[PDB]
Amino acid sequence: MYRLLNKTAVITGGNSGIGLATAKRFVAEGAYVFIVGRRRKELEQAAAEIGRNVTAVKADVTKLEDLDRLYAIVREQRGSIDVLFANSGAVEQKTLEEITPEHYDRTFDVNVRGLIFTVQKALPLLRDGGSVILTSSVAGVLGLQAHDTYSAAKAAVRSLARTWTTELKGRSIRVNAVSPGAIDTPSRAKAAAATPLGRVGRPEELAAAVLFLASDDSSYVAGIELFVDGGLTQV
Amino acid sequence: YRLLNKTAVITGGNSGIGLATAKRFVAEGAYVFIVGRRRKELEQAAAEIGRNVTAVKADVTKLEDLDRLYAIVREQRGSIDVLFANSGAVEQKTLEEITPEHYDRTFDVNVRGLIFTVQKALPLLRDGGSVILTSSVAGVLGLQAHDTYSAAKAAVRSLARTWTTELKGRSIRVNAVSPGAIDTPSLENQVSTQEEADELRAKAAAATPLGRVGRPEELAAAVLFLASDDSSYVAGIELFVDGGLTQV
Amino acid sequence: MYRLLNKTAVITGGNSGIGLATAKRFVAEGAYVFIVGRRRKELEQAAAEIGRNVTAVKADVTKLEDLDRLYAIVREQRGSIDVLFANSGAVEQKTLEEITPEHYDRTFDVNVRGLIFTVQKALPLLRDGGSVILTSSVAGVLGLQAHDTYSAAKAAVRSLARTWTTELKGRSIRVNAVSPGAIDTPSLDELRAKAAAATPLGRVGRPEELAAAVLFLASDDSSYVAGIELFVDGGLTQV
Amino acid sequence: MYRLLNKTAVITGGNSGIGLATAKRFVAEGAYVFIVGRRRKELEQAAAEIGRNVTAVKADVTKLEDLDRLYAIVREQRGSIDVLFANSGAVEQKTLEEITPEHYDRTFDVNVRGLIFTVQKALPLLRDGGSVILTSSVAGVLGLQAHDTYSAAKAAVRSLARTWTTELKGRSIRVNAVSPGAIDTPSLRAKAAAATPLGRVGRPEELAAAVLFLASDDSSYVAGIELFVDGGLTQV
Numbered sequence: 001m002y003r004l005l006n007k008t009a010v011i012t013g014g015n016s017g018i019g020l021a022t023a024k025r026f027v028a029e030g031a032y033v034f035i036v037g038r039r040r041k042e043l044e045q046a047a048a049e050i051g052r053n054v055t056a057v058k059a060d061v062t063k064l065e066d067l068d069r070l071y072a073i074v075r076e077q078r079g080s081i082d083v084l085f086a087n088s089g090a091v092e093q094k095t096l097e098e099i100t101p102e103h104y105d106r107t108f109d110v111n112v113r114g115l116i117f118t119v120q121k122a123l124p125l126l127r128d129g130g131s132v133i134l135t136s137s138v139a140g141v142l143g144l145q146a147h148d149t150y151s152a153a154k155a156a157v158r159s160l161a162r163t164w165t166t167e168l169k170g171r172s173i174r175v176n177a178v179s180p181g182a183i184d185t186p187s188r189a190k191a192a193a194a195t196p197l198g199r200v201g202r203p204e205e206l207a208a209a210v211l212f213l214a215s216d217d218s219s220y221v222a223g224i225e226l227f228v229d230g231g232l233t234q235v
Numbered sequence: 236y237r238l239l240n241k242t243a244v245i246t247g248g249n250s251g252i253g254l255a256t257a258k259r260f261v262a263e264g265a266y267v268f269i270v271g272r273r274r275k276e277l278e279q280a281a282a283e284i285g286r287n288v289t290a291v292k293a294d295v296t297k298l299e300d301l302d303r304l305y306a307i308v309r310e311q312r313g314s315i316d317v318l319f320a321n322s323g324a325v326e327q328k329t330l331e332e333i334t335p336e337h338y339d340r341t342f343d344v345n346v347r348g349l350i351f352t353v354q355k356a357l358p359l360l361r362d363g364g365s366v367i368l369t370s371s372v373a374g375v376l377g378l379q380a381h382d383t384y385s386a387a388k389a390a391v392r393s394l395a396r397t398w399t400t401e402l403k404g405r406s407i408r409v410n411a412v413s414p415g416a417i418d419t420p421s422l423e424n425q426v427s428t429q430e431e432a433d434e435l436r437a438k439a440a441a442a443t444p445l446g447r448v449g450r451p452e453e454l455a456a457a458v459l460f461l462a463s464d465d466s467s468y469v470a471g472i473e474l475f476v477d478g479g480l481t482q483v
Numbered sequence: 484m485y486r487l488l489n490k491t492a493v494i495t496g497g498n499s500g501i502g503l504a505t506a507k508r509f510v511a512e513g514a515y516v517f518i519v520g521r522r523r524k525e526l527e528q529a530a531a532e533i534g535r536n537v538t539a540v541k542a543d544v545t546k547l548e549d550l551d552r553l554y555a556i557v558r559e560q561r562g563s564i565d566v567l568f569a570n571s572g573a574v575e576q577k578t579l580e581e582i583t584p585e586h587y588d589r590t591f592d593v594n595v596r597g598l599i600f601t602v603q604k605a606l607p608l609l610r611d612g613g614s615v616i617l618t619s620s621v622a623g624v625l626g627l628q629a630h631d632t633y634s635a636a637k638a639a640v641r642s643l644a645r646t647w648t649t650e651l652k653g654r655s656i657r658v659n660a661v662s663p664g665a666i667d668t669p670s671l672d673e674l675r676a677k678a679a680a681a682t683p684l685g686r687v688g689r690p691e692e693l694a695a696a697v698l699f700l701a702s703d704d705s706s707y708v709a710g711i712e713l714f715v716d717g718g719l720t721q722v
Numbered sequence: 723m724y725r726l727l728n729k730t731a732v733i734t735g736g737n738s739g740i741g742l743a744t745a746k747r748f749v750a751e752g753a754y755v756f757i758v759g760r761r762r763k764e765l766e767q768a769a770a771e772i773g774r775n776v777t778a779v780k781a782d783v784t785k786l787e788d789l790d791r792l793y794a795i796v797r798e799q800r801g802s803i804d805v806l807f808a809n810s811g812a813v814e815q816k817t818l819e820e821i822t823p824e825h826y827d828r829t830f831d832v833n834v835r836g837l838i839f840t841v842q843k844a845l846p847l848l849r850d851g852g853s854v855i856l857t858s859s860v861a862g863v864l865g866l867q868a869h870d871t872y873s874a875a876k877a878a879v880r881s882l883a884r885t886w887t888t889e890l891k892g893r894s895i896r897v898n899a900v901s902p903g904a905i906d907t908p909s910l911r912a913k914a915a916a917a918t919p920l921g922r923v924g925r926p927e928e929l930a931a932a933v934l935f936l937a938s939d940d941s942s943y944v945a946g947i948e949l950f951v952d953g954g955l956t957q958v
């Protein structure tokens with residue numbers, strides 16, 4: 001506890017899976033968390049599971065006007081952002097032969113386009129010395145059947161952590177990417193066979209790695225790709 | 236010669252790296268289709284190449300232009316041995332400056348158009364063919380005001396991995412080339428003055444171990460390696476052609 | 484606060500710099516620490532700075548018999564090892580033209596040879612589920628003038644984290660490499676503000692900052708992290 | 723007449739596998755080649771298979787006095803070096819628990835120590851603008867059971883290509899690493915082919931062709947890289 005004491009965190013995709021596990025860990029570490037998603041019922045249930053120091057905000061990150069509304073609320077309730085975890089994303093499998101323009105747009109709108117504007121519109125509220133975490137994926141460095149657009153989109157996310165390291169260094173804002181392997185979320189058994197640790201990861205394990213990047217334990221860590229995959233991409 | 240009687244399609248082939256590659260390919264015995272949007276430059280490029288070339292006007296962001304392109308290739312040559320997906324463009328904008336229109340322009344040409352260029356080439360691509368994607372050193376660097384371009388070129392490199400896996404049954408190799416600073420009309424188009432362009436150039440030469448910008452013919456020669464049988468056991472890679480910039 | 488509660492840690496090169504800063508953090512998190520080095524007075528002064536739950540062990544990690552002695556002491560006093568931080572290393576600058584066999588041998592003996600046998604001889608004591616941290620360097624992915632053998636040796640260190648991930652997975656032992664950038668340690672003046680200019684964060688790192696990253700890898704917070712290279716360099720190698 | 727016309731190339735480990743395959747391709751491209759190895763009969767059969775424009779040199783590259791002899795022969799017969807392919811290496815499998823000091827010393831002496839001094843002593847003869855190719859391995863980026871010392875040594879080899887890029891840039895000498903995957907040579911069943919997208923082991927001639935790219939002027943703007951020649955094994 002106390003490892004994020006009194007810090008204000010915004011987590012997109014915070015109503016399920018990894019974002020929710022991270023929201024819980026952040027609150028346990030003393031932070032106040034805004035969880036962001038499109039479904040209000042799931043946001044309300046997630047916020048109830050978190051139990052304290054949480055505000056749920058309905059927002060589609062692909063809509064600029066929803067991001068403006070999100071940050072107006074953050075400005076009303078807390079006034080600034082210390083930690084931003086841009087975790088909203090979705091995987092849809094299509095082979096190259098199968099790719100449609102709509103499939104391409106759905107993948108890049110949420111994973112890249114919405115991520116760019118999520119971070120852009122947080123800049124006025126981000127405090128100097130803050131920490132931004134981007135969700136990439138092991139897919140960003142692999143050649144996975146039928147993951148064409150998702151893998152390419154997550155590779156784009158990792159690149160943005162590099163560029164934003166350079167652009168935000170004057171404000172001492174650190175930007176790092178986390179690249180999860182197989183995590184037991186709503187997003188089968190071969191992932192456990194291909195991973196040295198021999199199992200899929202738990203969402204709490206990804207939350208703990210994101211906590212490292214959000215916390216002062218990583219104060220000299222900038223621009224990296226932190227693989228949290230039980231060794232999958234490393235051997 | 237090293238591409239004797241091979242059929243090559245080069246998008247962005249009317250200038251810079253694509254044109255130098257077209258010239259080298261024809262010099263190695265290939266028949267080349269050069270593809271671009273500008274008719275004056277396509278005709279002059281085809282005239283400079285001089286032989287074994289068909290210029291095709293096509294905007295890779297328009298699906299119907301890609302259909303027409305591959306109808307022309309099917310009629311004139313019947314199949315594709317080498318596909319060099321080289322069309323792309325850089326516009327400098329910082330994170331604060333990014334507009335939806337800037338983002339869309341960058342990813343439409345660098346990623347969307349690249350995906351459908353390769354997708355629509357699949358029926359004509361021969362088993363054992365070679366596909367080369369143009370990424371960039373920007374795809375592994377953190378360059379001021381290159382947010383969308385660098386991210387887009389990282390996406391391009393990822394696709395070489397995915398398509399290696401998906402096309403392995405047809406023995407089609409897919410590889411990415413990542414140029415450093417190459418002396419083309421593109422280095423001068425992203426800046427607003429030629430006092431800036433000479434700064435960007437001698438800065439690139441100073442950060443590169445070989446101490447100079449690359450010549451377009453040098454990138455063409457690396458693309459030739461990936462197109463030729465010399466790379467028959469090379470698949471999914473990122474070939475940096477940058478004078479050592481990203482390697483030290 | 485107690486993230487290494489009841490854990491036994493062995494830190495080679497714990498006499499000073501990163502190893503010493505890591506030893507302090509480990510003890511603050513509840514571990515019992517063995518610090519290992521060649522100089523006894525400096526070990527005693529370091530252990531006094533640590534203040535509690537520490538045993539200093541004199542050992543030259545390049546000498547197989549000193550490693551045997553080290554682990555015999557660990558076996559009597561604590562019985563097992565939970566965390567191994569192999570931090571012994573040294574930089575000597577020589578250009579390719581300048582390299583002698585002795586310069587080559589000294590660099591790889593401490594950086595690679597001594598590390599291999601430090602880990603080999605810890606295996607009988609390493610508990611299932613333990614964590615091993617190897618010290619690589621940003622030099623392992625760079626082309627730095629006159630760092631020929633040091634950079635190559637640190638690249639070898641990072642490779643071993645991969646191989647040992649595969650070999651030790653049946654025992655659920657995680658092996659990870661930390662790759663420090665410029666850290667303000669006794670490894671020195673004015674080349675420091677040279678490194679600070681090349682780093683996005685605009686500064687050299689503090690040893691406590693590297694210690695915090697090693698703690699992450701040692702702690703259960705990194706329980707799904709295996710085989711990685713964790714760059715702690717203010718962005719130097721990442722942009 | 724060709725891509726290496728009248729160029730002088732030195733290939734260590736040139737009496738078998740990739741070394742020999744590369745020597746043959748280099749000669750086919752117009753080069754004069756020195757092949758280097760320890761065994762006289764096999765160097766002698768290697769030179770006979772190449773057939774022309776080749777000098778066999780008996781030398782243990784881990785012995786500094788043999789390297790001096792090697793480069794004296796190169797200077798006398800050809801006068802300078804355009805391409806250096808430092809290809810000597812060997813795999814011995816030992817797990818961490820099994821590693822002995824003798825095993826470690828043998829692995830690093832051939833793969834790293836001998837490689838360093840091979841390149842060091844070639845420096846006086848290397849032409850400005852020359853090309854140096856180092857043999858790394860896919861093992862240098864993988865976690866392969868019982869490959870502890872070999873993988874670490876090949877990782878060291880790839881690192882040296884970066885450092886020497888920086889140190890030799892004033893002479894415009896390019897240094898690049900080639901990292902072979904599974905290549906069908908006497909140094910070695912379906913497991914390698916099953917993990918590789920191209921679905922087969924590589925032919926020695928295929929690695930030779932990749933080394934030729936790095937040796938030839940086609941790679942004149944390529945420096946410090948790791949060229950994977952592995953059918954996609956490490957790339958997907």
Ligand SMILES: NC(=O)c1ccc[n+]([C@@H]2O[C@H](COP(=O)([O-])OP(=O)(O)OC[C@H]3O[C@@H](n4cnc5c(N)ncnc54)[C@H](OP(=O)(O)O)[C@@H]3O)[C@@H](O)[C@H]2O)c1
Pocket residue numbers: 012013014015016017018019036037038039042059060061062087088089090091110114135136137138179180181182183184185186187
């Ligand atoms: N699980 C894995 O193995 C894995 C591996 C690599 C990367 N990731 C990435 O981790 C992140 C979270 O995924 P997950 O594993 O936790 O599965 P998940 O439970 O499905 O999480 C998806 C989250 O993103 C939200 N979301 C999706 N689209 C959104 C949109 N336009 N606007 C706002 N919110 C949106 C979702 O809430 P709403 O639908 O209500 O909006 C939800 O909270 C993603 O970026 C994912 O690609 C996961």
Ligand SMILES: NC(=O)c1ccc[n+]([C@@H]2O[C@H](COP(=O)([O-])OP(=O)(O)OC[C@H]3O[C@@H](n4cnc5c(N)ncnc54)[C@H](OP(=O)(O)O)[C@@H]3O)[C@@H](O)[C@H]2O)c1
Pocket residue numbers: 246247248249250251252253270271272273276293294295296321322323324325344348369370371372373413414415416417418419420421422
């Ligand atoms: N230092 C470098 O030069 C460098 C570095 C990294 C990557 N690259 C990449 O190398 C590739 C070649 O660019 P270049 O350096 O040689 O400059 P360039 O070719 O002179 O300019 C871009 C080329 O792509 C074509 N193009 C642009 N948009 C197109 C579209 N919708 N459809 C069809 N063609 C299009 C252009 O032809 P039209 O305008 O007539 O259509 C032109 O031929 C690019 O992808 C570039 O990003 C270059």
Ligand SMILES: NC(=O)c1ccc[n+]([C@@H]2O[C@H](COP(=O)([O-])OP(=O)(O)OC[C@H]3O[C@@H](n4cnc5c(N)ncnc54)[C@H](OP(=O)(O)O)[C@@H]3O)[C@@H](O)[C@H]2O)c1
Pocket residue numbers: 495496497498499500501502519520521522525542543544545570571572573574593597618619620621622662663664665666667668669670
């Ligand atoms: N500082 C940086 O910027 C930086 C950057 C990259 C990597 N690193 C790595 O980080 C590690 C920690 O070094 P440091 O920077 O903190 O310097 P340091 O610890 O101040 O000096 C090296 C330490 O290793 C010990 N050591 C050296 N040879 C030994 C041997 N044969 N047996 C036992 N112990 C030995 C030394 O103690 P004794 O001499 O008393 O034995 C000393 O405590 C090193 O491996 C270094 O290569 C540091």
Ligand SMILES: CC[C@]1(C/C=C2/CCCc3cc(OC)ccc32)C(=O)CC[C@@H]1O
Pocket residue numbers: 325371372373378379381414415416417422425435438439442
């Ligand atoms: C197209 C511009 C680009 C940029 C590279 C440099 C040269 C290397 C260092 C560098 C630092 C920068 O920060 C402001 C910006 C640019 C740069 C080129 O030269 C060609 C491709 C690459 O995209």
Ligand SMILES: CC[C@]1(C/C=C2\CCCc3cc(OC)ccc32)C(=O)CC[C@@H]1O
Pocket residue numbers: 574620621622627628663664665666678681
């Ligand atoms: C020697 C200290 C060390 C390497 C120094 C650098 C890294 C930064 C760039 C640099 C440029 C130089 O001039 C040619 C010389 C050295 C250097 C660091 O600090 C990081 C690891 C390693 O211990």
